Structure formats: structure tokens, C-alpha cells
Symmetry: D3
Subunit: 152 residues, 6 copies
């Protein structure tokens, strides 16, 4: 269904390096619909929970520290296959494996400063959206271009 | 002083026409610092108040209805001369009078569908910011590029 | 009215210098609607007629020769104030006078290699459209974005 | 040979979504030469014939209906390997399979709203060019950049 | 004559903020021909002489210090009216007076961090080119597009 | 290590076709640091040497003649994995094999007119840098964004 949603965040390095507009532009250009957007400063506990699956990994403390060091831009995007599509737009985890055309391919070098985050599955997207956004921060609306973007 | 702030909004037509990222990019490119950001659908009362100085104008009810018809993106930008600078970036109120290079000059035709709003003075900016954002919704942070952008 | 139309051409230097897509993008980005488009090679006589008002000027023979030297892209754009607005997008006739942001400001140097043409009035746009396009070559259609671009729509 | 040609179309969704200039820019940027261009509204029968090989597919009637629902921009591009190369610029048929950098990768979501068409072989490109363009509508010209783009030239 | 030349430099803040490519692109797009290009670290004495006319102005010490604080990219561009045209591309001295579309209009805020320099007259361009470039660093060549850019 | 360096050149066709700025922009956007830059017309002997590994190939004399036919822009870039990363940005040697998003994928058609060169290994990069640049022509400096681009 085109009502699938994903959580995308410009990480603190992406905000610091002025990539918020560029990232949003790429999602808008694709045809995805923006339904949540905010600037916020994650707390360390928020970072810990967001990345809870990686708690035993040796880079976790540094990841959690960095993610809560400065503002991020959190987003919710809606569209057909938008979880997979968002990841495609972002590129590989390690920017050295990412291809030009992707966000990490064009703008990042180091796996620990890879500019952006995107949910990796439909289930994790639901958890992340619910973690970062209140219901009143998600806007239900209809794109005037929906029939131009979707056949059904 | 570099701590001046202004309120910029992408209006519903700007959101619908996929100009959010482009608009944000222009403010980031200039050196301005994003300290507040949100997506929300104005209520009719918010629309009325935001445009309260125009209540006696014959286009008011249309303006209010349209401004409350779907999501806007509200933003707070910080920088030296950012109120005036934001308006320079936006272009003339009537896109017919706006020059190429500006947001309205590049992307709009009609005065009633002119994509974006910006505060018209330091004082009106303070009032708009106070109206659209709670204290806890602004993020204070230091651009790592601040010494590259400002002499003092 | 939003149904006003203008004729814009990418001149032979514009085609040669790969500016067709860039020029079309600027018009699309503004909200104008493309209702006629073609690539053609003007004849010298077509050039002479298109610029007939300028027959006495010293630059006319070179203008007419160049305009017919290779392909142009001819366009009809429709929108509110599109005659004046198209010319604003093009920038000043002499690129030395044009401002960055405009097509001539960004991409051209010399008044004789100024990349593009736009009709100078509502009446001349009508004449130019009728000169370059047959009735059946225009396409009338409704932009899905018309109510986002126009308040009255 | 550098004189190979292909047919590329911006489909009605591409025109509606203001992608004509962007698509043309990508082809110009690559070094391909534009030798035919027009805006037209296909008839349903023209659509049926253009996609005749796909008549048995379950999506055919919707494809043919949509393709004839509004204007397309039809193009003939010329260059070395332009049939294959044009398709690479377009990206995978289904945009979910297309990579960022390509037209479908950057701008489309749904296989039925995939913004553009490109001929799939040298022989089908010949057939498509002849179907959509009369001989006198093509413009043969020499790019001033031909020796910068091609070693053999 | 189309053989006029000017000196353009990306100043240390422009290099630091990754605007070298963008600036070069704008001059290439216009039709101007690049005939000299280099990355170098100005010395303080070099900065002093480059800005010698401003030696009595109260910002001179800071200007000279900043100009020699980091690398610049020096360039020589050739074309009809390229001294005036280069300045047009750069925008006003003070970015707050510069219009969108120009280099300072799009990318700068503060007069003391205005990203780029351009010679202000034919005579000063000649002095600057001769000061910053050796003869062997200027390349004489012919653009394959010269007949497309110039009528004569 | 982040101090790896590579040699990238815009070839004469790339200079003639106004791609210098675009190419530089792509390397800047990625996070790589420009430490050497110059415009020069290679001599025939420089062309022969630069491409010395291909002396026995049948396209050598054409390659050498063309590479020495007008100006190139020579560059030295510094960053983690920059040799491999530069080549990823450039795309496949034959533009027919190169993907959109890369320099050759976006801008070239013919293997003999493929716009740009990049060193193929850490060692060949060191040799190319040493061949094209004098010690005094490189500039060492610290990007103000280094902590935003690199974790360590
Ligand atoms: N330093 C370091 N950071 C890593 C490594 N792997 C992942 N990260 C960081 O941890 C984040 C989360 O990892 P993961 O969920 O597997 O990747 P993602 O979903 O692609 O971001 C990544 O985006 C990186 O910022 C690593 O090996 N080293
Ligand atoms: N229909 C219509 N709308 C107008 C007119 N003047 C202003 N507006 C709209 O009302 C908004 C608020 O007007 P104003 O505060 O005076 O201009 P701004 O601060 O430059 O946006 C403008 O941005 C326009 O969208 C008008 O004469 N007619
Ligand atoms: N060489 C030369 N060409 C000119 C001059 N004035 C105009 N032109 C060319 O003639 C075209 C037609 O001139 P005009 O209709 O007056 O200006 P436009 O409507 O703004 O294009 C221009 O677009 C230029 O290409 C001139 O003084 N010298
Ligand atoms: N709904 C739908 N449309 C399809 C499907 N496959 C192809 N199409 C559409 O039909 C067009 C023609 O298909 P085809 O010629 O096989 O692919 P192409 O040559 O890569 O465009 C495609 O470009 C799509 O727009 C499908 O499975 N479902
Ligand atoms: N702090 C400060 N710097 C200035 C002022 N005026 C000029 N500058 C700097 O000095 C440089 C040289 O001044 P000038 O030659 O008059 O301007 P330009 O030719 O437009 O750069 C400018 O580009 C600015 O970087 C000023 O009033 N205050
Ligand atoms: N004409 C021709 N040129 C070639 C061929 N292979 C390589 N070249 C050219 O020679 C240059 C050097 O080749 P090589 O070092 O193998 O490739 P690179 O390091 O990927 O550029 C390439 O960039 C091409 O421009 C070929 O088969 N034919
Ligand atoms: Mg993950
Ligand atoms: Mg106002
Ligand atoms: Mg005229
Ligand atoms: Mg097909
Ligand atoms: Mg000066
Ligand atoms: Mg090699």
C-alpha cells in the first residue's frame, strides 16, 4: 500500500554540514509525501533506545554520544515501498560502499559520520515513528499529485 | 547582532508543490542557522491571527481558508540581518514583481499562491516565533562554521 | 487571464551550447504550462519575417543569418502574465545588462549570442505563435497543479 | 557508430510533473544530440501500436489509456550507443528497482507512473522514430562539440 | 575585446565552506574562459599589497590577517567585459546588499566573510593577475565554443 | 588513515566542455579536502610518462597527443579512502559502462574522451602527485569541518 511510512533523520553531522534541504529535496523529488517534520535535540537515553539493537557493538557508546551531541531533523515519509525506497536514497551504511547518486555516496566518507538515518523494515519504521513523533505531529493530507505518482 | 531570528513558513501551495527542501537549502546555503522546524496544518484561528493585520482586506477570507487548508512547514532561522535577508531570499510579495534567483521569482506566478511567508520586521518576527513555537521546541546550538561565516 | 500565451525560442547558440533542458526547466519551475514544442531549422526568410521590425538595423543581416544557421527549439507557454514573465526569466536583451538568476545572466555574454528569444507583447506573441505553429500542433491540457498555482482556479 | 538514434518520450505523468526540462538536460549533459522534438497528444490507437508487443499483458489497457490521456514529449537523440545509453539514463522499468542518479531512480515510484519511455533496441528505435516522426521533422546538424565528445570524430 | 582578463579568488572562507566548484561552475556556465588556476596560501605581506589601497581603513589588519589565514583559489578568466561581468557574478561587497543569484547573495552574510574577490577595473585586474600569477601559469588556448559565445 | 591522497585531473575534453567546476564540486561535497590545484597544458613528454603503463597499447599515440593538446586541471585530494573514492566518483573507464551519478556516467560517451583521470592505487597516486606537483605547490590546512566528517 502507498500508505506505508518510514522514519528518516538527518543526523547531527548532516545538520551541521547543511544537508537538511538537500535530503528533503531528494525525498520530495522521488514522489514521497512528507507527513512529519521536526528539529530536535535527542537526549542520550533517546539515542540509546533508538539504537538499542546495537548495544553490544563496540561503537555503541560513541554512536549514542554523537547522535545526542546536537540537533537532528526527524521526518516521516509516506509512500509505496517507502521503507526500502528511503534506504535506496540514503545509500549503504558505510559511505565507502555507497554509490554516487545516494545521500551517503555524494556527501559522506566515514561510517560514523554518515549524515542520515532511515528505518530498515516496516516493523522498525513503525517503532521509530511512534518513538520520535506524537500523533499530533503527523499530518494527514492528500498530495494533489497522487494520481500522477500512482496508477491505482 | 548574529542572534536575530525570523519566522519563515512554506505555505500550503509550497508544500504541495514540493518546494520545502529547495527553500530550506537556500537558507542553509546563505549561512543562516535553523533553530526551529515543524510541519503542521494551521487551524482557521491560527490563520486568522497570523494574518491579523490584513483582516479588513478583501482577500482575507480566501487567504485564511487556504492557509488552513493543509500543512505548512514553519521555521525559525537565526543570523545577522536574517529578517531582511529572509525577505530578500523570498522575493517580492507579488511573484510578478519578484526577480529570478528569489523563491517567488523562480517558482510562483500568483500573489495568492506565493509559496512562502517571512516575518516583515524584528518585532513581528518575535511575535510570530512566539505564536508558532513553544519555548521547548526551539533548539540552541553552535554551527561549527560560525567563524567562517562571521568576522566577529 | 491565466490563458495568456507567449512564444519562446532557444536560438541556435542555445541549442549548440546544451541549454534546451535548462531553459525549459526554468519555465516549468515557475508554473508556466507548455502547450507547444518543436525543434526546427528556420529558413533565412522565416528569420527575416520573425525579426521584420528590425530590418533597418545594422545587425539585421547577421541576426537573420545566424537564426537560420541551425536548429532552434520553438515553444508556446501559457500562464498569467507569461509574456512579461517569460522575458523576465530570459533577462535583459544584452547579457552584459542581465542579472544572475536569469537565463542570459547565467549563460550568455554577447548580445548577438544571447541564447534565446521571447515575444515582447501580447499582440506580438499571438503573431509569433501563429507564424511558427499550426493550430493542430498546440496541445490544450489542464495542469494537475493549476489550483496550487492560481488562487482564482 | 555515433549516428545511432533512439526514441525517448516523456510520458504524460512526466509532463504533468514538470520533468521535461530535467530529462532533456540529462541527455544533453551526457553528450547526446537532439535531432527531433515535439509535444503531442497520442491517440489511444497510437498508444496501442507503440506498445503492440505488450497487447496480451494484463496492464496493457491501462498503459494505453494513460499514455493517450494527455501530452507527451517525443524526442530523437543521436549518439554512440544511444539506444542502450538512453535506457541507462532512464533507469530500471520499475522505479522500485531503479538506482538514484537515473531519471526513474530520482523522480518516480510506480511502474505505471514511470515518467518516460526509451526504445529497447536499434531496430525498435528505427521503428519508433519512423512511427512518431515524418522525415522532414528531423533536423540534421553538427554539434560544435563533436570532436570533444568523440575521439574518432 | 573578448581577450580582457580578470582576477577572481575564492577567499579562505569560500575554500573552507566548499564553494570552489560552485564558483568555478558559475564562471564556466557564463561563457568565460579559464586561463589560470591555483591553490595557494597567501602570506600576510601578499595580502597587504593586494589590498594596499585600503591600508588606512579600520578593517585592514583583520582583512589582511584573515586573507592569509588559509588557502585561497586564485583564477584568471578571459572574456568580453569579464572584469565587470565577474563583479556582477560575485554580487555587492556587503552580502546584505547582494541579490539572490549572485555568489555573495546566495552564500554569504557578513562583509568580512564574503567568500570571493574580483578585480574592480581593467587596470587593477592587470596588476592583480601580474601579482598572483607567473607567465607560465597562464595558459593560452582556444575554446571550441568561441563562435557559439561571440558573434565576431 | 584520513591523510591518504590521490591525483585527479580534468582532461582536455573536460576543460573544453566546462566540467571543471562540476567535478570539483563533487569532490568537495563528498568531504574530500583540496590540497593542490593547477591549470597547465601537458607537454607531449608529460603525457607519455603519465600514461607510461599504456605505451604498448594501440591507442597510446592518440591518447598522448590529445592529453597534450590543451589545458588540464590537476588536483590533489586528501581524505580517508580517497584513491578508491575518487574512482568511484569518476565512474568506469568506458563511459558506456559508467552509471548515472558518476562523472563519466553523467557527462561522457566515448572511452577516449572520458573527461577526467584518477590515480588507480595509493602508490600510483604518490607517484602522480610527485610528478605533477612540486613540494612547495601543495597546501596543508585543516578543514573546519574535519570533526563533522570523521569520527576519529
Ligand atoms: N564507528 C562505527 N559506526 C558504525 C559501524 N556500523 C554502524 N555504525 C553506525 O551506527 C549506525 C547504525 O548502524 P546500522 O543500524 O547497522 O546501520 P544503518 O541502519 O545503515 O544506519 C550507522 O548508521 C552508523 O552511523 C561501525 O562499524 N563503526
Ligand atoms: N489575493 C491577494 N492576496 C494578497 C494580496 N496582497 C497580499 N496577498 C497575500 O497575503 C499574504 C500576506 O500579505 P502581506 O503580509 O502584505 O505580504 P508579505 O508579508 O510580503 O507576504 C501575501 O504573502 C499574499 O499571499 C492581494 O492583493 N491579493
Ligand atoms: N549585434 C547586435 N545584435 C543585437 C542588438 N540588439 C539586438 N540584437 C539581437 O537582436 C535580437 C532582437 O532584438 P530585440 O527584438 O530588439 O530584443 P529582444 O526582444 O529583447 O530579443 C536580440 O535578442 C539580439 O539577439 C545589437 O545592438 N547588436
Ligand atoms: N502496471 C504495470 N505496468 C507495467 C508493468 N510492466 C511494464 N509496465 C509499463 O509498461 C511500459 C512498457 O513496458 P516494457 O516495454 O516492457 O518496459 P520498458 O521498455 O523498460 O519501458 C513500462 O515502461 C511501464 O510503464 C507491470 O508489471 N505493471
Ligand atoms: N569588516 C569589514 N570588511 C570590509 C569592509 N569593507 C570591505 N571589507 C572587506 O574588504 C574587502 C575589500 O574591500 P573592497 O575592495 O572595497 O570590496 P570588493 O572589491 O567588493 O571586495 C571586501 O571584499 C571585504 O572582504 C567593512 O566595512 N568592514
Ligand atoms: N581509445 C581508447 N582509449 C582507451 C582505451 N582504454 C583506455 N583508454 C584511455 O586511456 C586512459 C587510461 O587508461 P587506464 O589507465 O587503463 O584507465 P583509467 O585509469 O580508468 O582512466 C583511459 O582513461 C581512457 O581515456 C581503449 O580501449 N581505447
Ligand atoms: Mg539501522
Ligand atoms: Mg507579511
Ligand atoms: Mg524582440
Ligand atoms: Mg519497452
Ligand atoms: Mg576590491
Ligand atoms: Mg589509469
Amino acid at each position: 500500500m502507498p500508505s506505508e511510512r518510514t522514519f528518516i533523520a538527518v543526523k547531527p553531522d548532516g545538520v551541521q554540514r547543511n544537508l537538511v534541504g538537500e535530503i528533503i529535496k531528494r525525498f520530495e523529488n522521488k514522489g514521497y509525501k512528507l507527513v512529519g517534520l521536526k528539529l530536535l535535540q535527542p537526549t542520550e537515553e533517546q539515542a540509546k533506545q533508538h539504537y538499542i539493537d546495537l548495544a553490544s557493538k563496540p561503537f555503541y557508546s560513541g554512536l549514542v554520544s554523537y547522535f545526542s551531541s546536537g540537533p537532528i531533523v526527524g521526518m516521516v515519509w509516506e509512500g509505496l515501498g517507502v521503507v526500502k525506497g528511503g534506504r535506496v536514497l540514503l545509500g549503504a551504511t558505510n559511505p565507502a560502499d555507497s554509490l554516487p547518486g545516494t545521500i551517503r555516496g555524494d556527501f559522506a566518507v566515514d561510517v560514523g559520520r554518515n549524515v542520515c538515518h532511515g528505518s530498515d523494515s516496516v516493523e522498525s519504521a513503525k517503532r521509530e515513528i511512534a518513538f520520535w513523533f506524537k500523533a499530533e505531529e503527523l499530518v494527514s493530507w492528500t498530495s494533489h499529485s497522487v494520481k500522477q505518482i500512482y496508477e491505482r
